[PDB]
mmCIF file with all atom_site columns, C-alpha atoms in Angstrom:
data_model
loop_
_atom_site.group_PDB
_atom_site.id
_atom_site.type_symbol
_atom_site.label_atom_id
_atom_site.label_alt_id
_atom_site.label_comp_id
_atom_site.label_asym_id
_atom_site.label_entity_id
_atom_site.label_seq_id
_atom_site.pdbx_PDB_ins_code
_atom_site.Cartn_x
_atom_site.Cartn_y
_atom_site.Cartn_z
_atom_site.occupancy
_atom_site.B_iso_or_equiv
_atom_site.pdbx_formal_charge
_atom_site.auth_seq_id
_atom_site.auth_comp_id
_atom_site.auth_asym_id
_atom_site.auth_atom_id
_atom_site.pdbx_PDB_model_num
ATOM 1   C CA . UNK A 1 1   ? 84.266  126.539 146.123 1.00 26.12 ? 6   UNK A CA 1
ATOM 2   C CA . UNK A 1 2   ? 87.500  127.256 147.354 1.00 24.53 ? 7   UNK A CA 1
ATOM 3   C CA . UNK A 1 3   ? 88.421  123.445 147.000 1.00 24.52 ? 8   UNK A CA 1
ATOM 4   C CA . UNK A 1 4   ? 86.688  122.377 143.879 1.00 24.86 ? 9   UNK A CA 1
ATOM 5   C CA . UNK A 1 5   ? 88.507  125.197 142.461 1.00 26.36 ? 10  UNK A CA 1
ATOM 6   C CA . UNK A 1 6   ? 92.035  123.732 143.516 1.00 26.58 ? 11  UNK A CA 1
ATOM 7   C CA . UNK A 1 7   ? 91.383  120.454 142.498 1.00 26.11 ? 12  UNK A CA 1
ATOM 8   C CA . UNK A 1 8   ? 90.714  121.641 139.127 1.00 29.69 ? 13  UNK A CA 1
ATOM 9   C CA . UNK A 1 9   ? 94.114  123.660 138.833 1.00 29.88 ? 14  UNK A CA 1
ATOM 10  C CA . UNK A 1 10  ? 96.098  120.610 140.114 1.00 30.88 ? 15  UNK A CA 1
ATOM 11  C CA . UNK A 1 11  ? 94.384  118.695 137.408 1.00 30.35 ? 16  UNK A CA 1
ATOM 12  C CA . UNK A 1 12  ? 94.972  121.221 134.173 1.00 29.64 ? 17  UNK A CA 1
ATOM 13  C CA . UNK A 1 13  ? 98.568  121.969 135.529 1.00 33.51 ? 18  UNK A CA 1
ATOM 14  C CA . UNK A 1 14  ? 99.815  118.441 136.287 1.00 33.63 ? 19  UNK A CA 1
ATOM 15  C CA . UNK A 1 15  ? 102.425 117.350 133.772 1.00 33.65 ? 20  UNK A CA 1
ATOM 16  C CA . UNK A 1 16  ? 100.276 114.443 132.445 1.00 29.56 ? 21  UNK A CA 1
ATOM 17  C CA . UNK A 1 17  ? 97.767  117.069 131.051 1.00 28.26 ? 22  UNK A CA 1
ATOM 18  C CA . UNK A 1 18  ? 99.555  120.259 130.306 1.00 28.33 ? 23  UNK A CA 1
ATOM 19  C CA . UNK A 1 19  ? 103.703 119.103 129.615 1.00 27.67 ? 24  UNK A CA 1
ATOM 20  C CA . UNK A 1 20  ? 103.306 117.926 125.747 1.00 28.10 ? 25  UNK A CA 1
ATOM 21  C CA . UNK A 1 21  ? 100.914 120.880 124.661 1.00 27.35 ? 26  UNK A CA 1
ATOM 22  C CA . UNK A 1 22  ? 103.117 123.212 126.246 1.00 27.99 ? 27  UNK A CA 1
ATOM 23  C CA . UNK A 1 23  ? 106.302 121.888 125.307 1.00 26.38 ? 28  UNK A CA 1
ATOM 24  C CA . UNK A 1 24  ? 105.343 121.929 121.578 1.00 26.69 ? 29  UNK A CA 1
ATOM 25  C CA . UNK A 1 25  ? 104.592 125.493 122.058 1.00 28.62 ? 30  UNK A CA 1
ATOM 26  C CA . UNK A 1 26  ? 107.195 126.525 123.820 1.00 32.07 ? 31  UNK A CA 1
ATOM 27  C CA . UNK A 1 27  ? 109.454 125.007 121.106 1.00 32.17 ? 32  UNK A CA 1
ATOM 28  C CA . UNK A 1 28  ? 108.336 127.273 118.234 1.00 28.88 ? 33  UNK A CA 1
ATOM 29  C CA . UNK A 1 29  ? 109.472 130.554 119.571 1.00 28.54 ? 34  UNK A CA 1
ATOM 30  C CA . UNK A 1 30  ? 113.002 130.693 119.250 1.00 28.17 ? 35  UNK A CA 1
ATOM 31  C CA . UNK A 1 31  ? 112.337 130.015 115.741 1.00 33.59 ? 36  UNK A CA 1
ATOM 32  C CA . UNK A 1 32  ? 109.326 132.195 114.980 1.00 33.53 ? 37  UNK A CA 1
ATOM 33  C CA . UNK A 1 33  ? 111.078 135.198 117.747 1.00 34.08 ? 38  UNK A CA 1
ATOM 34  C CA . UNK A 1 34  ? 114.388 135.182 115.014 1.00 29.93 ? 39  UNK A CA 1
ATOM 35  C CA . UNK A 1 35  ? 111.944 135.584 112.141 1.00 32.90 ? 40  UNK A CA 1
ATOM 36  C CA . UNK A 1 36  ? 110.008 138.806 113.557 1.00 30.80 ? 41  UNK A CA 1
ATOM 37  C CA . UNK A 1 37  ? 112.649 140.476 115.470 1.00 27.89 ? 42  UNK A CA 1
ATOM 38  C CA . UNK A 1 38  ? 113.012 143.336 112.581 1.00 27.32 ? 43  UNK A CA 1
ATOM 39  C CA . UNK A 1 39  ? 109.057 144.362 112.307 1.00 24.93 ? 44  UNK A CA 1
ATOM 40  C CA . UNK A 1 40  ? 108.358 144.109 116.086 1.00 27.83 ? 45  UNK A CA 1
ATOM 41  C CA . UNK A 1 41  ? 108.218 147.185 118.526 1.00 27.75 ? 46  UNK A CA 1
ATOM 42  C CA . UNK A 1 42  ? 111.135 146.477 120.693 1.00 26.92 ? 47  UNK A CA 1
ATOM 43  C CA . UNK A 1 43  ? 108.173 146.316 123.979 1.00 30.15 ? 48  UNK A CA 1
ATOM 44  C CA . UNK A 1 44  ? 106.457 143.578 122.243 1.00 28.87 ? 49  UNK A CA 1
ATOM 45  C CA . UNK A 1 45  ? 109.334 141.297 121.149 1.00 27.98 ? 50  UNK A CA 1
ATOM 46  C CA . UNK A 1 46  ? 110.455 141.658 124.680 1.00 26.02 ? 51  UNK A CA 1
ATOM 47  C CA . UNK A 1 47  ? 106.417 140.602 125.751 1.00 25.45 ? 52  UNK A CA 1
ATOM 48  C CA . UNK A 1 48  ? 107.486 137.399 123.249 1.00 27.24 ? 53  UNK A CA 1
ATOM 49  C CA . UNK A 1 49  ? 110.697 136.511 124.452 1.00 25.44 ? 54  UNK A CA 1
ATOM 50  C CA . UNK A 1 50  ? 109.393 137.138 128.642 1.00 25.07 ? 55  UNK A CA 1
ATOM 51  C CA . UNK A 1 51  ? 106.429 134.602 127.322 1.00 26.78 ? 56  UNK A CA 1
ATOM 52  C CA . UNK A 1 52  ? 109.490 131.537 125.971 1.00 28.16 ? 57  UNK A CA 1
ATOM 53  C CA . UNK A 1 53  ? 111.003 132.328 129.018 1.00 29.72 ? 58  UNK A CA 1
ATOM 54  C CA . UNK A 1 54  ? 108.517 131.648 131.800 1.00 28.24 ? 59  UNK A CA 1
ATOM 55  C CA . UNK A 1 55  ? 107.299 129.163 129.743 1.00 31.03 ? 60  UNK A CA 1
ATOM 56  C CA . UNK A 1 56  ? 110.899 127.529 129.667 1.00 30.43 ? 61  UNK A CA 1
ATOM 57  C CA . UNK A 1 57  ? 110.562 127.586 133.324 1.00 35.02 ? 62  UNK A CA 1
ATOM 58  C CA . UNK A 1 58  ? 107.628 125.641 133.295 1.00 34.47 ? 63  UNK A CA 1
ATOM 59  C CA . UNK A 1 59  ? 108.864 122.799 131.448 1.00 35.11 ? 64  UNK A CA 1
ATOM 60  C CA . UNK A 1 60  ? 111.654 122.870 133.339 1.00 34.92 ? 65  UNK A CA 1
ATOM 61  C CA . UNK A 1 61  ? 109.629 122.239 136.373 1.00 36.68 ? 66  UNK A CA 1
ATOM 62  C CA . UNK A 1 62  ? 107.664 119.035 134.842 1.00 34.85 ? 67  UNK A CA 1
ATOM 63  C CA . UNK A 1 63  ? 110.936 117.659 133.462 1.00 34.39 ? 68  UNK A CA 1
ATOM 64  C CA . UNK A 1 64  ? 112.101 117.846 137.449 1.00 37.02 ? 69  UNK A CA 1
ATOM 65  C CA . UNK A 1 65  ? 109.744 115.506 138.547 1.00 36.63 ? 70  UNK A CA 1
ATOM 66  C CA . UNK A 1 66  ? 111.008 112.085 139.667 1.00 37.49 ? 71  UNK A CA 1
ATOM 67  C CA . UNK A 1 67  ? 108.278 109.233 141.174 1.00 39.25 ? 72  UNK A CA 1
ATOM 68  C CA . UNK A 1 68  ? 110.573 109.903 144.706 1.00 36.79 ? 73  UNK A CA 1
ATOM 69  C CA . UNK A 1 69  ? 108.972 113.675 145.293 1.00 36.77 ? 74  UNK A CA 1
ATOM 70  C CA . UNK A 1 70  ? 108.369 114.260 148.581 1.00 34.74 ? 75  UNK A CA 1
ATOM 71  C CA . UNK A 1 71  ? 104.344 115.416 148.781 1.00 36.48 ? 76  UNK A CA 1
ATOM 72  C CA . UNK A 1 72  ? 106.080 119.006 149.912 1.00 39.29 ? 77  UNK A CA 1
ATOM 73  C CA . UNK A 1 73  ? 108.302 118.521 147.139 1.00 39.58 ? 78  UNK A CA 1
ATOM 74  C CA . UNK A 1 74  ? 104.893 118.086 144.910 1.00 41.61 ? 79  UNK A CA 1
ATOM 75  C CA . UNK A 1 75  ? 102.765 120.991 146.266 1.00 42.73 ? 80  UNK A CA 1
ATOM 76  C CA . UNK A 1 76  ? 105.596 123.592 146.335 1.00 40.45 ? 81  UNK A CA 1
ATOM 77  C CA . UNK A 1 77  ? 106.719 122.617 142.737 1.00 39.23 ? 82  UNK A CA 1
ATOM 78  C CA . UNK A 1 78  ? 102.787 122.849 142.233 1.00 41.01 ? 83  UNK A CA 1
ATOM 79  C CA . UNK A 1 79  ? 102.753 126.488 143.695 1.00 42.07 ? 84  UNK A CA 1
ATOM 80  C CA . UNK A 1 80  ? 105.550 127.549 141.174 1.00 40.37 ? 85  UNK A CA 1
ATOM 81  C CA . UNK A 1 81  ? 103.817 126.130 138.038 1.00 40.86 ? 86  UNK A CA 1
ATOM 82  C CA . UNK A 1 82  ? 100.685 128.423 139.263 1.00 38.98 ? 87  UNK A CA 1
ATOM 83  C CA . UNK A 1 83  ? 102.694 131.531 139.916 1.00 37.84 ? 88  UNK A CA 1
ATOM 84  C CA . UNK A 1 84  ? 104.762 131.123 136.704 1.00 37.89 ? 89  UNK A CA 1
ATOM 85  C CA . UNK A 1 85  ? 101.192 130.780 134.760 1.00 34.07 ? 90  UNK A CA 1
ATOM 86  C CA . UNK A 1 86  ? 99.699  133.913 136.420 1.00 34.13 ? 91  UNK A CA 1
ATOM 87  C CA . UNK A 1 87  ? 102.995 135.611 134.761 1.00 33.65 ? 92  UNK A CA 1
ATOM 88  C CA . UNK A 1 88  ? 101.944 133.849 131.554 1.00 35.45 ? 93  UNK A CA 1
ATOM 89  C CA . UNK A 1 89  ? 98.319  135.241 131.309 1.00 34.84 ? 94  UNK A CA 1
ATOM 90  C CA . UNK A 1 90  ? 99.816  138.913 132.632 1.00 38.52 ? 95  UNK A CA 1
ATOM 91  C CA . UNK A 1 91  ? 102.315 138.729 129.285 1.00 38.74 ? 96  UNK A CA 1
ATOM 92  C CA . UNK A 1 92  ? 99.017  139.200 127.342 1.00 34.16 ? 97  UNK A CA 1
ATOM 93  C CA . UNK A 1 93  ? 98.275  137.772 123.960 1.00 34.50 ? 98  UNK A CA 1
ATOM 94  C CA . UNK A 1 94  ? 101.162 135.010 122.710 1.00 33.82 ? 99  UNK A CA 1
ATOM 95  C CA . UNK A 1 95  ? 102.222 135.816 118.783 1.00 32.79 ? 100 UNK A CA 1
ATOM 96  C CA . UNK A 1 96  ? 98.957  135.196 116.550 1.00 29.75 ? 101 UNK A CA 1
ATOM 97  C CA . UNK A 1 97  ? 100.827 132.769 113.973 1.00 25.70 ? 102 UNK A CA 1
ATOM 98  C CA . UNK A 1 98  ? 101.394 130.830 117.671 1.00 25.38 ? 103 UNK A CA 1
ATOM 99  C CA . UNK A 1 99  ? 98.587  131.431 119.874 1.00 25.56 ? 104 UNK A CA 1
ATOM 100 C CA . UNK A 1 100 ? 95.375  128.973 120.751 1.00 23.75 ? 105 UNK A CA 1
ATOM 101 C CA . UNK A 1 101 ? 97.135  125.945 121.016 1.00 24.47 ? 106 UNK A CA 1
ATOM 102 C CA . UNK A 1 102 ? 96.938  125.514 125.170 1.00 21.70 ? 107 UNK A CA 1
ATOM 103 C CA . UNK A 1 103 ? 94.122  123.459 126.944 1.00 24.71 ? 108 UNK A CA 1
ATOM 104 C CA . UNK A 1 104 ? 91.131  125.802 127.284 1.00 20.83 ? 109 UNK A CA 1
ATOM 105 C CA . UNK A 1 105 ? 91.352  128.326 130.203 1.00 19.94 ? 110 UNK A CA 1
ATOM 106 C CA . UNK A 1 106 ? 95.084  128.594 129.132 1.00 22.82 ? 111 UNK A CA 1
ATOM 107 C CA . UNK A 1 107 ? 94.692  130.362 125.927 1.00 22.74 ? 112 UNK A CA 1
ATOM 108 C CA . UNK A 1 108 ? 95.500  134.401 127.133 1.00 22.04 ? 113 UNK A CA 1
ATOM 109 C CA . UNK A 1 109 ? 93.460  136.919 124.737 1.00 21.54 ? 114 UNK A CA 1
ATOM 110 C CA . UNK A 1 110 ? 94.443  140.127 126.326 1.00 18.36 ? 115 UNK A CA 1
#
C-alpha cells in the first residue's frame, strides 16, 4: 500500500491541485494575524504566524516550478512540500474565522 499511498500524496500536493486553495489561504493571515494580535495568548499567535510561515514556504515552492525541472529537481521539491505539510498538521488547528478551506485530508482539527 506503500505505493498507492504515494501516488495519492503526489496527486493532492502537486501545484495543479493544492497552489490556488492554498494561496488564497495563505493570503488572509497577515490581515486577520494584525486584527487578533491583542486578545491572543502570545503561544497561540506565535502557532498562527509559524502556520503563514510554512505555508509561505509552500507557495514559494509551487511558484519555483519551471516546465525545465529536472525529475530530481521534481521529487526533492516534492519531498519538501511533504515535510513542510507534516509541520502544518503539527501547528494544530488554523484560526476558526480561517480554517476548513484546504482539500480534504488537509484540513488540521487538532
Amino acid at each position: 500500500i506503500l505505493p498507492i499511498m504515494q501516488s495519492i500524496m503526489q496527486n493532492l500536493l502537486s501545484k495543479d491541485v493544492l497552489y490556488p486553495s492554498l494561496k488564497e489561504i495563505t493570503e488572509k493571515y497577515p490581515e486577520w494575524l494584525q486584527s487578533h494580535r491583542e486578545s491572543l495568548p502570545p503561544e497561540q499567535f506565535e502557532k498562527y504566524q509559524e502556520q503563514h510561515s510554512v505555508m509561505c514556504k509552500i507557495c514559494e515552492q509551487f511558484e519555483a516550478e519551471t516546465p525545465t525541472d529536472s525529475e530530481t529537481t521534481q521529487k526533492a521539491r516534492f519531498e519538501m512540500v511533504l515535510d513542510l505539510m507534516q509541520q502544518l498538521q503539527d501547528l494544530g488547528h488554523p484560526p476558526k474565522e480561517l480554517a476548513g478551506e484546504m482539500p480534504p485530508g488537509l484540513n488540521f482539527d487538532l
